[PDB]
Amino acid sequence: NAPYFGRPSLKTRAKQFEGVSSKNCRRIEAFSD
Amino acid sequence: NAPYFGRPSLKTRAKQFEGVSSKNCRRIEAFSD
Amino acid sequence: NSEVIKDLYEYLCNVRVHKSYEDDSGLWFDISQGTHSSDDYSIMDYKLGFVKGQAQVTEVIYAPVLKQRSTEELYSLQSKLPEYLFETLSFPLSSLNQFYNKIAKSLNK
Amino acid sequence: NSEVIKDLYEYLCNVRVHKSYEDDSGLWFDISQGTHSSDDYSIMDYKLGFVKGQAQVTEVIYAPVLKQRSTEELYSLQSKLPEYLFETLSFPLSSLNQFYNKIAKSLNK
């Protein structure tokens, strides 16, 4: 039951990072509200 | 040096809770942006 | 690792959860929100409780922790925050993020 | 205790820091932000890096993690978020909370 009817959580987003490495940036000084 | 010239942090706010117990509420349904 | 991460939540979200415990009424957290001219800081300390209310639905309790704050700090708080944040409140779990954002935006004024 | 607390940061602040590590460029975090009609959710996954830039001042890198998202998810993201959040960015550490709040408000549209 719980895998299917449970409340979704951001914990399961860990999978999104699989295979991505952190090894050219647009520079922004501040972000408005 | 570090106690005096270091960047303040919210970690030192733990002291604010000393002596307060969680043992009559105004009910609000939502908060605007 | 857990402490580097709590430090990041402090700098990203301007909040620190100091501790959590479960007592006779429910699940509780001791929290501070706000930001630290070096004299300019705006911080609220509060307890946040998760309690079973009617029909076992979890309700949120907010209890501000104001006893150790100075009159100068309270005046500043009161000038930034809505008046309801100076008393104990109850609100639905579905409004929790709205609550956080209300304190956050207010403290960041 | 640390996991009950991370769960609370998720429900209070709509963000989860999954892990942190230090590599050859600096201090990194894998992060997801947003909220979960059961089909209506708005979530961004990103890496956030803290790197020594010029003069050893810590700069923040944002690198969105978009490879596994579907075209439907991206369209929805693009309709809610500013265009700059779809590329790697650099910004000052002092703007970190403003950055979080920009993504948060956008995801909550």
Q: Can you spell out the DSSP letters for D58-79?
A: EEEEEEE--TT--HHHHHHHHH
Chains that touch C (3 or more CB pairs under 8 A): B, D
Nearest to B31 by CA among C44, C46, C14, C83: C83
Beta carbons of D43 and A8 less than 8 Å apart: no
Q: Do C20 and D27 touch (CB under 8 A)?
A: no
The coordinates were experimentally obtained by X-ray
User: How far from C65 is each of B29, C31, D95, CA to CA, in Å?
Assistant: 22, 9, 28
Distance from CA of A5 to the nearest CA of D (A): 11
Domain containing residue D81? 1-109
User: Which is it for the CA torsion B19, B22, B26, B30, positive or negative?
Assistant: positive
Domain count along chain C: 1
Tokens representing D16 are 């989860």
Task: Please choose, from the candidates B20, D8, D88, A21, the residue with its C-alpha nearest in 3D space to the C-alpha of residue C29.
Answer: D8
**CATH at residue C32:** 3.90.1150.80
How far apart, in whole angstroms, are the C-alpha atoms of residue D51 and residue D46? 16
CA-based nearest residue to D73, from D100, D42, D47: D42
The Cα–Cα gap between C94 and C59 comes to: 9
Q: Which residues contact A27 (CB under 8 A, 6 or more apart)?
A: D89, D90, D91
Distance from the Cα of D2 to chain C's closest Cα (Å) equals: 7
